[PDB]
Design a protein around this ligand. Structure first.
Ligand SMILES: *[C@@H]1O[C@H](CO)[C@@H](O[C@@H]2O[C@H](CO)[C@@H](O[C@@H]3O[C@H](CO)[C@@H](O)[C@H](O)[C@H]3NC(C)=O)[C@H](O)[C@H]2NC(C)=O)[C@H](O)[C@H]1NC(C)=O
Ligand SMILES: *[C@@H]1O[C@H](CO)[C@@H](O[C@@H]2O[C@H](CO)[C@@H](O[C@@H]3O[C@H](CO)[C@@H](O)[C@H](O)[C@H]3NC(C)=O)[C@H](O)[C@H]2NC(C)=O)[C@H](O)[C@H]1NC(C)=O
Ligand SMILES: CCCCCCCCCCCCO[C@@H]1O[C@H](CO)[C@@H](O[C@H]2O[C@H](CO)[C@@H](O)[C@H](O)[C@H]2O)[C@H](O)[C@H]1O
Ligand SMILES: *[C@@H]1O[C@H](CO)[C@@H](O[C@@H]2O[C@H](CO)[C@@H](O)[C@H](O)[C@H]2NC(C)=O)[C@H](O)[C@H]1NC(C)=O
Ligand SMILES: CC(C)CCC[C@@H](C)[C@H]1CC[C@H]2[C@@H]3CC=C4C[C@@H](O)CC[C@]4(C)[C@H]3CC[C@]12C
Ligand SMILES: CC(C)CCC[C@@H](C)[C@H]1CC[C@H]2[C@@H]3CC=C4C[C@@H](O)CC[C@]4(C)[C@H]3CC[C@]12C
Ligand SMILES: CC(C)CCC[C@@H](C)[C@H]1CC[C@H]2[C@@H]3CC=C4C[C@@H](O)CC[C@]4(C)[C@H]3CC[C@]12C
Ligand SMILES: CC(C)CCC[C@@H](C)[C@H]1CC[C@H]2[C@@H]3CC=C4C[C@@H](O)CC[C@]4(C)[C@H]3CC[C@]12C
Ligand SMILES: *[C@@H]1O[C@H](CO)[C@@H](O)[C@H](O)[C@H]1NC(C)=O
Ligand SMILES: *[C@@H]1O[C@H](CO)[C@@H](O)[C@H](O)[C@H]1NC(C)=O
Ligand SMILES: *[C@@H]1O[C@H](CO)[C@@H](O)[C@H](O)[C@H]1NC(C)=O
Ligand SMILES: *[C@@H]1O[C@H](CO)[C@@H](O)[C@H](O)[C@H]1NC(C)=O
Ligand SMILES: *[C@@H]1O[C@H](CO)[C@@H](O)[C@H](O)[C@H]1NC(C)=O
Ligand SMILES: *[C@@H]1O[C@H](CO)[C@@H](O)[C@H](O)[C@H]1NC(C)=O
Ligand SMILES: *[C@@H]1O[C@H](CO)[C@@H](O)[C@H](O)[C@H]1NC(C)=O
Length: 918
C-alpha cells in the first residue's frame, strides 16, 4: 500500500538518525545558520504604499500613460481649521440681503491664519545630501510659471487668496450709497461676491478689488471653505489651506528634497496646534504622512510580541512532564527548531533581493510558531504513550514511534505549505511575499523537526538513564468522552452544529468587501482626526481626469462638435454627458462638471479683442497679446459674422499654442495657461497627442464608495469612448479612461469576489486528494473531514461578517491558511478512527476521542493560543483586526468542530472496521 511504504521508510530513517544523534544535529543547523546569516546582506524593507497595488494590472497601466504624457500627480499638504466654541452672527449685505455668518469667518481668526500661511511660505530646510537650504520655490507646483518659479508663484489654495494674501486689502473698507443706502461694504461682501463668481477680475462692489489668487489661477469655493450645504457659503464651518508640491519618480534626488520639506511643515503645524489650543481646532496631513504612520510601530511592537516565544517555551516542559513528586531541554529544542526555520526562510529571500514588508516582520514569526510546534506534541506524546517492547534498544523504539505518527505530520505540514503557496497568487505584493515566506518557513520547519528534533529527542532519551497515565490522558478524557458520547448529547450536538452551519450560511451574505484606510493606522494617530474632519466637512472628493488616448483628430469641425458644449454642438457630447452625469450624483459619483479646453479655446477664438494680429511693421503677423493698448492691433485672429465659429485646420495648428500660453488678465479672462497649460500634450509640428479633462468626485467616505465611484466613472468613460469612435477620422483603439490618484488601490475590489471563490475552492482539491493518498482514508471518511473543513470555512465567514471584519486581500490569505490548518484538527482524529478495532462504532469513536483527542487539544489548540493572543495588543488596527480576530475565531471554531462534532459524526457514518494487520 502507499501508506505502509511511507511509514516503513520513516521508521528506518528515525532509527538511523537516533543512532547518530550528535552528527545529524550539528550537520543540520549549519545550513540554517548559513541561510539565517543573510538577514543583514540584502535585508531591505519596502516602506511606500506601492506594496498595495498590482504592477501588471489595468489601473497601473493607465497611471503609466498619464505619468508619461502629462507628468505625475502633485502631492498634497492640507490643514482643516474649525472654531468649535464660536457663535454665528447676522450681517446685512448691500447686495445679498440678510445673511448669517459662521463663527469661523472672522477677522480675528483670518489674520491668525494669514500669519500661519505666510510663515509656512517662508520655510527652509537644510538638506544634508545636497549642501543647500531647500526653499518652497524649488519644490512647489507652479502652474503658471514652472521655469523660473518665484516664491509667489506657488500653488497655495485658501480663503485668503481672494484678497491675494494682502493684509491691507483684507482690512479695506468702502462706503457705497447704492439705492440711497449708505452701507459700509467690508471684506465679507467681496468674499460673498468671489464665492459665487470665482473668475472675476474686478469686484462688483464699491471697493474694486480683484478676485483671483496671486499665482494667477482662480480658486474655487470648494478648495477654500467646507462644511456648507447647497450654496450658502457664509455658513461654512471649516477653513482649508492646501500646499501642493511637485511629484517625481522614486529615483530622482528632488524627491528627497520634497519629502524633507514636509517634515518641517509637520513640525510647524504641530507648533501651531500647541500654540492655538483655545482658539482653533486644527487637523493636518502631509503627502508623506500616510507612508510613515503605517510602518511606524513595526520596531515598537516586536519586543512586546517576543514574549509569545517565552510563553510557548514555558508551555512545553510542563505539559510534557511525568510529574509524580521535566523535559526542559525539549521546550528549548522546540523553540529553536521553530525560531531557526523562521529566520532561515526570512533570510533566504533576502539573498534573492525580494524586499520585505511590515506584515512579514509582525505576523510571520508568531504565526509560524502557532503551527510549528503542532507536530512536536504529536511526536512526543506518541513517544511516551507507546510502551517499549521487551529487549529492544531505545533507537528502534524511537524509530517505531516516529514511523507510527509521521505520515500525519507530513500530511499536515504539506497541506499547510500547499495552501500558503497556492494562496500567493494574489496580485498585491505585500501579501504575496508574506505567503511565500510562510510557505518556505513551514517547509523548513517540517524538514528541521524531522532531522534535528529527532536527534535531540534521542539525546534527551539517553539522559533519563542517569538524571499513572498522567491527568489529561485518562483523568479527564475518560470522564469527558462518556459525556460527549452519551446518547442524548449525541443527537443534540448533531443538530446544534447543523443549525450553526445554516445560520452562518445565511449570515455570510451580509459581508462587506473592501478595506478602509482608517483601519490601517495606529490608534493613537493624528491622521484619524484628519480623516474624521475630511469625511465630515469637505464638499468635493478627489479630482478626476478623463484622459483621451492618442488617435482622435481634434482639428476637424466634426471632431470639435463631438466635444464642445456651446452653440452648434452635437447633442450627448463629451462635456454634455459629463454635465448630465453630475445632475444625479448618487448614481454617477461626480460633483463638478468637466472643464474642457476645447470649449474655452472656442470661446477664446471669438473676436472680442482677446486674439489679435498686428496690421504691419517689423513684426507682421506673429502675435498681439491682450496687454497691448496700441492702434496696430485692429485685426482679429478669426473672422466675423458667422454662427458657431470654428477654426480651420491650418488655424487650429497655429492658434492653439498661443492659447495655451496666454495669461488671463482684466482685458482677457477668456482662458489660457491658468488651467490648460499642462492638460494638453503637443507634438513637434503642433498636433495634439493626448488631452485630459478635469472633474471632481463627490465626497467618498468608506471603501465601497471608492469602488462604486471607480466603476461608475469607468462606465461613463466607456459610453463616451463608444460614442467618440463613430466620428469619422478617429482610428480604433482610441479610448477615454478616468484617472484618479486612488484608483490603483481600489481597483482590486471590482473582481476580488470571483478571485476569492476560485482560490479558496482550488485549495480543497489538494487537501482531500492528498489526504486519501498519504493516509489510509479511502472514501467514506475521506469526504467527511472535507465536510468538516467546509463547515469551518462557512462558520468562519459567517462570524467574520457578524463581528464586522471586511473581506479584503489581507483576510483572504487568512482564510486560505485556515483551510490548510483545519486538516490538523480533523485528520488526526479521523485517522485514529480508521485504524481502530472495536465491536461497535460507539466504542471506536470513544477510543478515537480518548487517544488522539487529548493530544490534539493539548498540542494543537493550546499551542497556537499564545501565538494568537499576543497579537491582540498590537497598536495597529490591521494586525489587531485581521490577524487576531480572524485567527482567534478559526482556532475556536476549528477546535470546536474537530473535537465535539467530528467524534459524534464518526459514531454514525464512520468507515467500516478493516482488519488492517499489515
Ligand atoms: C508628451 O508625450 C511625449 C511622448 O511620450 C513625452 O515625451 C516622452 O518623455 C519621456 C520622459 O522624458 C520619454 O521617456 C524616456 O525615454 C528615454 C529614452 O528611451 C529613456 O532613457 C528614459 O528613461 C525615459 N523616461 C523614463 C523615466 O521612463 C519618452 O521617450 C518621450 N517620448 C518622446 C516622443 O519624446 C513628453 O514628455 C510629453 N509632454 C510633456 C511636456 O509632458
Ligand atoms: C483631421 O481632419 C481634417 C479634415 O477632415 C483633415 O484635413 C484634411 O487633410 C487632407 C489630407 O489628408 C486634405 O486633403 C488635401 O487637400 C488638398 C487641398 O485641397 C488637396 O490637394 C487634396 O484634397 C489633399 N492633398 C492632396 C492629395 O493633394 C484636406 O484638404 C484636409 N481638409 C481640411 C478641412 O483642411 C486632417 O488631415 C485630419 N487630421 C489628421 C490627423 O490627419
Ligand atoms: C498592507 C497594509 C498596508 C497597505 C494599506 C494601504 C491603505 C490604502 C492607502 C491609500 C493611500 C492613498 O491615500 C490617499 O492619498 C491621497 C493623497 O492625495 C489623499 O488625498 C488628498 O489629496 C487630494 C488631492 O490632492 C485631496 O482631494 C484630498 O482631500 C486629500 O486627502 C487621500 O485622502 C488618501 O486617501
Ligand atoms: C497690498 O495692497 C496695497 C494697497 O493696494 C499696496 O500698496 C499700494 O502700492 C502701490 C504701488 O506702490 C501704491 O501706488 C499704492 O498707493 C499703495 N496703496 C496703499 C494704500 O498703500 C501694496 O503694495 C500691496 N502689497 C503687496 C505685497 O502687493
Ligand atoms: C551516503 C553516505 C555518505 C552516508 C551518509 C549520508 C548522510 C551523511 C547524508 C545523506 C543525506 C543527507 C541529509 C539530506 C537532508 C537533510 C536535510 C537538511 O535540512 C539537513 C541535512 C540533512 C539531514 C542531510 C544530512 C546528511 C545526510 C543524512
Ligand atoms: C522573536 C522574533 C523577533 C524573531 C525574529 C527576529 C528577526 C527575524 C527580526 C526581528 C527584528 C527584525 C529587524 C528589525 C530592524 C531591522 C532594521 C532594518 O533596517 C532592516 C531589517 C531589520 C534588521 C529587521 C530584520 C528582521 C528582524 C531581525
Ligand atoms: C514579481 C512578478 C512580476 C513575477 C512573478 C511573481 C509570481 C507571480 C510568481 C513567481 C514565483 C511563482 C511561484 C513559484 C512556485 C509556486 C509553487 C507552486 O506549487 C504553485 C505556483 C507557485 C506559487 C508560483 C506562483 C507564481 C509565482 C509566485
Ligand atoms: C464562536 C467561538 C469563536 C466563540 C467566540 C465568539 C465570540 C468571541 C465572538 C462571536 C460574536 C462576537 C461579538 C459580535 C458583536 C460584537 C459587537 C461589537 O461592537 C463588539 C464586538 C462584539 C461584542 C463581538 C465580540 C466577539 C464575539 C462575541
Ligand atoms: C441665520 O441663522 C439664524 C439661526 O436662528 C436664523 O434664525 C436666521 O433666520 C438666519 N438668517 C437668515 C438670513 O435666514
Ligand atoms: C541657509 O544656508 C546657509 C549656508 O548653509 C546657512 O548659513 C543658513 O543658516 C541657512 N538658512 C537658515 C534658515 O538657517
Ligand atoms: C527665471 O527667472 C530669473 C529671474 O527673472 C531669470 O534670471 C532666470 O534666467 C530664469 N530661469 C529660468 C530657468 O527660466
Ligand atoms: C462712509 O464710510 C467711511 C469709511 O467707512 C466713514 O468713515 C464715513 O463716515 C462714511 N461717510 C459718510 C458720509 O457717512
Ligand atoms: C471651546 O469652549 C468650550 C467651553 O468653554 C471648551 O470646553 C472647549 O474645550 C473649547 N474648545 C477649544 C478648542 O478651545
Ligand atoms: C439635438 O439634435 C437635434 C437634431 O440634430 C436638434 O434638432 C436639436 O436642436 C438638438 N438639441 C436639442 C434637443 O435642443
Ligand atoms: C452608457 O451606456 C448606456 C447606453 O448609452 C447609457 O444608458 C448609460 O447611462 C451610459 N453610461 C453611463 C455611466 O451613464
Amino acid at each position: 500500500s502507499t501508506h505502509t511504504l511511507l511509514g516503513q521508510f520513516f521508521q528506518g530513517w528515525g532509527t538511523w538518525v537516533a543512532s547518530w544523534p550528535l552528527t545529524i544535529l550539528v550537520l543540520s543547523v549549519i545550513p540554517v545558520v548559513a541561510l539565517a546569516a543573510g538577514l543583514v546582506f540584502t535585508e531591505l524593507t519596502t516602506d511606500p504604499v506601492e506594496l498595495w497595488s498590482a504592477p501588471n494590472s489595468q489601473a497601473r497601466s493607465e497611471k503609466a500613460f498619464h505619468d508619461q504624457h502629462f507628468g505625475p500627480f502633485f502631492r498634497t499638504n492640507q490643514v482643516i481649521l474649525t472654531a468649535p466654541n464660536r457663535s454665528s452672527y447676522r450681517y446685512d449685505s448691500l447686495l445679498l440681503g440678510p445673511k448669517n455668518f459662521s463663527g469661523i469667518l472672522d477677522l480675528d481668526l483670518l489674520l491668525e491664519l494669514l500669519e500661519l500661511q505666510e510663515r509656512l511660505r517662508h520655510l527652509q530646510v537644510w538638506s544634508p545630501e545636497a549642501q543647500r537650504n531647500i526653499s518652497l520655490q524649488d519644490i512647489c507646483y507652479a502652474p503658471l510659471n514652472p521655469d523660473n518659479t518665484s516664491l509667489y508663484d506657488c500653488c497655495i489654495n485658501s480663503l485668503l487668496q481672494y484678497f491675494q494674501n494682502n493684509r491691507t486689502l483684507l482690512l479695506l473698507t468702502a462706503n457705497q450709497t447704492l439705492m440711497g443706502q449708505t452701507s459700509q461694504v467690508d471684506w465679507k461682501d467681496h468674499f460673498l461676491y468671489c464665492a459665487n463668481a470665482p473668475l472675476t477680475f474686478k469686484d462688483g462692489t464699491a471697493l474694486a478689488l480683484s478676485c483671483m489668487a496671486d499665482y494667477g489661477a482662480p480658486v474655487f469655493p470648494f478648495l477654500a471653505i467646507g462644511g456648507y450645504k447647497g450654496k450658502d457659503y457664509s455658513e461654512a464651518e471649516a477653513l482649508i489651506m492646501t500646499f501642493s508640491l511637485n511629484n517625481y519618480p522614486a529615483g530622482d534626488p528632488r524627491l528627497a528634497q520634497a519629502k524633507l520639506w514636509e517634515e518641517a511643515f509637520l513640525e510647524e503645524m504641530r507648533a501651531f496646534q500647541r500654540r492655538m489650543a483655545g482658539m482653533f481646532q486644527v487637523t493636518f496631513m502631509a503627502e508623506r504622512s500616510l507612508e510613515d504612520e503605517i510602518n511606524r510601530t513595526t520596531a515598537e511592537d516586536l519586543p512586546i510580541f517576543a514574549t509569545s516565544y517565552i510563553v510557548i517555551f514555558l508551555y512545553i516542559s510542563l505539559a510534557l512532564g511525568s510529574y509524580s513528586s521535566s523535559k526542559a531541554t525539549l521546550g528549548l529544542g522546540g523553540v529553536a527548531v521553530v525560531l531557526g526555520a523562521v529566520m532561515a526562510a526570512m533570510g533566504f529571500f533576502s539573498y534573492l533581493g525580494i524586499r520585505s514588508s511590515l506584515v512579514i516582520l509582525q505576523v510571520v514569526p508568531f504565526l509560524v510558531l502557532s503551527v510549528g510546534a503542532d507536530n512536536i506534541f504529536i511526536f512526543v506524546l506518541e513517544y511516551q504513550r507507546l510502551p517499549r517492547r521487551p529487549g529492544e534498544p531505545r533507537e528502534v523504539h524511537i524509530g517505531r514511534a516516529l514511523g507510527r505518527v509521521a505520515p500525519s505530520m507530513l500530511l499536515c505540514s504539506l497541506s499547510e505549505a500547499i495552501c500558503f503557496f497556492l494562496g500567493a497568487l494574489t496580485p498585491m505584493p505585500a501579501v504575496r511575499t508574506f505567503a511565500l515566506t510562510s510557505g518556505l518557513a513551514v517547509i523548513l520547519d517540517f524538514l528541521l523537526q524531522m532531522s534535528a528534533f529527532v536527534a535531540l529527542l534521542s539525546l534527551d532519551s539517553k539522559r533519563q538513564e542517569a538524571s499513572g497515565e498522567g491527568l489529561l490522558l485518562g483523568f479527564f478524557q475518560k470522564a469527558y468522552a462518556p459525556f460527549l458520547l452519551h446518547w442524548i448529547t449525541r443527537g443534540v450536538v448533531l443538530l446544534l452544529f447543523l443549525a450553526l452551519f445554516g445560520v452562518s450560511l445565511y449570515s455570510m451574505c451580509h459581508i462587506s468587501v473592501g478595506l478602509d484606510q482608517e483601519l490601517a493606522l495606529p490608534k493613537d494617530s493624528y491622521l484619524l482626526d484628519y480623516f474624521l474632519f475630511l469625511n465630515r466637512y469637505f464638499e468635493v472628493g478627489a479630482p478626476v481626469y478623463f484622459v483621451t488616448t492618442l488617435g482622435y483628430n481634434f482639428s476637424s469641425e466634426a471632431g470639435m462638435n463631438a466635444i464642445c458644449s456651446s452653440a452648434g454642438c452635437n447633442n450627448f457630447s463629451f462635456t454634455q454627458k459629463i454635465q448630465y452625469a453630475t445632475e444625479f450624483p448618487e448614481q454617477s459619483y461626480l460633483a463638478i462638471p468637466a472643464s474642457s479646453w476645447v470649449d474655452d479655446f472656442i470661446d477664446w477664438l471669438t473676436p472680442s479683442s482677446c486674439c489679435r494680429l498686428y496690421i504691419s511693421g517689423p513684426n507682421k503677423d506673429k502675435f498681439c497679446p491682450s496687454t497691448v493698448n496700441s492702434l496696430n492691433c485692429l485685426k482679429n485672429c478669426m473672422s466675423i459674422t458667422m454662427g458657431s465659429v470654428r477654426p480651420s485646420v491650418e488655424q487650429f495648428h497655429k492658434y492653439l499654442p498661443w492659447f495655451l500660453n496666454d495669461r488671463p488678465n482684466i482685458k482677457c479672462p477668456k482662458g489660457g495657461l491658468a488651467a490648460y497649460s499642462t492638460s494638453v500634450n503637443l507634438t513637434s509640428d503642433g498636433q495634439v497627442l493626448a488631452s485630459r479633462f478635469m472633474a471632481y468626485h463627490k465626497p467618498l467616505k468608506n471603501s465601497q464608495d471608492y469602488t462604486e465611484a471607480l466603476r461608475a466613472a469607468r462606465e461613463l468613460a466607456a459610453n463616451i469612448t463608444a460614442d467618440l469612435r463613430k466620428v469619422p477620422g478617429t482610428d480604433p483603439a482610441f479610448e477615454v479612461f478616468p484617472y484618479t490618484i486612488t484608483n490603483v488601490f481600489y481597483e482590486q475590489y471590482l473582481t476580488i469576489l470571483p478571485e476569492g471563490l476560485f482560490m479558496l475552492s482550488l485549495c480543497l482539491v489538494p487537501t482531500f486528494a492528498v489526504s486519501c493518498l498519504l493516509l489510509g482514508l479511502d472514501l467514506r471518511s475521506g469526504l467527511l473531514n472535507l465536510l468538516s473543513i467546509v463547515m469551518i470555512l462557512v462558520d468562519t465567514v459567517g462570524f467574520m461578517a457578524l463581528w464586522g471584519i471586511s473581506y479584503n486581500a489581507v483576510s483572504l490569505i487568512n482564510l486560505v491558511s485556515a483551510v490548510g490548518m483545519s486538516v490538523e484538527f480533523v485528520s488526526h482524529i479521523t485517522r485514529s478512527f480508521a485504524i481502530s478495532t472495536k465491536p461497535t462504532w460507539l466504542e471506536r469513536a470513544k477510543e478515537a476521542t480518548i487517544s488522539m483527542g487529548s493530544a490534539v487539544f493539548a498540542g494543537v489548540a493550546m499551542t497556537n493560543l499564545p501565538g494568537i493572543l499576543v497579537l491582540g495588543l498590537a497598536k495597529a488596527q490591521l494586525i489587531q483586526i485581521f490577524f487576531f480576530r480572524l485567527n482567534l475565531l478559526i482556532t475556536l471554531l476549528g477546535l470546536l468542530h474537530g473535537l465535539v462534532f467530528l467524534p459524534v459524526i464518526l459514531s454514525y457514518v464512520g468507515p467500516d472496521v478493516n482488519p488492517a494487520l499489515a
